Ligand binder design. Structure first.
Ligand SMILES: CC(=O)N[C@H]1[C@@H](OP(=O)(O)OP(=O)(O)OC/C=C(/C)CC/C=C(/C)CC/C=C(\C)CC/C=C(\C)CC/C=C(\C)CCC=C(C)C)O[C@H](CO)[C@@H](O)[C@@H]1O
Ligand SMILES: [Cl-]
Length: 253
């Protein structure tokens, strides 16, 4: 439990936030704790009235303004100013409140998956199986079809990446995240999960999160921007404005 420097509720909210009755957002950050850059960056917005969730993967190389540091790769916000600055960067990029944030290292992820007795993933790509084999020196060998993956297998699945674009990797992360929720429908954190709300409050949201009528994914499209060999992902501004309106409406702001 670690409070954000911004205060009791997001500065983006014009009205008083009621966590038990309002739609809300959660930012999930995956870190390699070998500050560190954020390699997994998933924002989930929950529509309380409609009992729906929308997942969004923020491209790690998205070309965005990092407050106090200028335009740069989104992933660097966590390196320059930790969770506080990542939250500020998201709130500026999408013009929405980030109500809750959860920061995880490899160990917390593996322990969560294993405590759930694995998570179900339908593997479909020989190329993905092959690249994971390469990543792990053959320690992780996935099979096509629907199988229950343990923590090590799931972790390798959400880490693998062919080249610059983390498009497919973000989709694998949202896939596994939703599988974790599915498996939970039926203490462990330790010092490896950091979140800006109490364990008690986190549990109070569990019934709502695990009884959603629908889960959907949305995308920030764009194109490669390589001004001097340094790779950025420039966001399509029309799609960005579309996503912003969609999440603003979901959050009732
Ligand atoms: C393996 C690889 O290929 N690496 C590439 C490169 O480095 P990289 O791209 O940074 O990857 P990496 O450093 O190894 O691992 C770091 C990568 C990632 C994606 C970080 C993963 C970290 C995690 C903690 C797991 C992923 C996060 C997910 C699925 C979302 C959040 C998950 C959480 C919070 C865990 C439990 C979930 C909970 C509590 C959800 C409940 C709450 C709600 C639903 C509101 O290195 C070479 C050149 O340098 C390249 O050639 C090479 O391709
Ligand atoms: Cl696959």
């Amino acid at each position: 439990h670690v409070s954000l420097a911004r205060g009791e509720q997001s500065v983006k909210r014009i009205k008083e936030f009621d966590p038990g009755k309002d739609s809300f957002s959660v930012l999930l950050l995956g870190i390699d704790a070998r500050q560190a850059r954020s390699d997994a960056n998933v924002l989930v917005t929950f529509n309380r009235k409609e009992k729906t969730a929308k997942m969004l993967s923020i491209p790690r190389d998205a070309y965005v303004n990092i407050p106090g540091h200028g335009y740069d790769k989104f992933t660097h916000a966590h390196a320059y100013g930790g969770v506080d600055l990542t939250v500020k960067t998201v709130e500026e990029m999408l013009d929405i409140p980030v109500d809750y944030v959860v920061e995880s290292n490899f160990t917390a992820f593996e322990d969560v998956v294993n405590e759930l007795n694995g998570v179900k993933v339908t593997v479909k790509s020989d190329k993905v199986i092959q690249q994971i084999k390469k990543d792990t020196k053959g320690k992780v060998v996935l099979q096509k079809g629907t199988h229950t993956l343990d923590g090590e297998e799931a972790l390798a699945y959400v880490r693998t990446r062919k080249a610059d674009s983390d498009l497919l990797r973000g989709q694998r992360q949202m896939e596994v995240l939703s599988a974790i929720i599915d498996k939970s429908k039926s203490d462990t954190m330790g010092q490896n999960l950091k979140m800006n709300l109490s364990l008690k409050d986190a549990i109070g949201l569990f019934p709502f999160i695990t009884s959603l009528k629908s889960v959907e994914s949305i995308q920030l499209t764009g194109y490669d921007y390589e001004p001097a060999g340094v790779y950025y992902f420039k966001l399509n501004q029309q799609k960005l404005q579309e996503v912003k309106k969609e999440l603003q409406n979901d959050l009732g702001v």
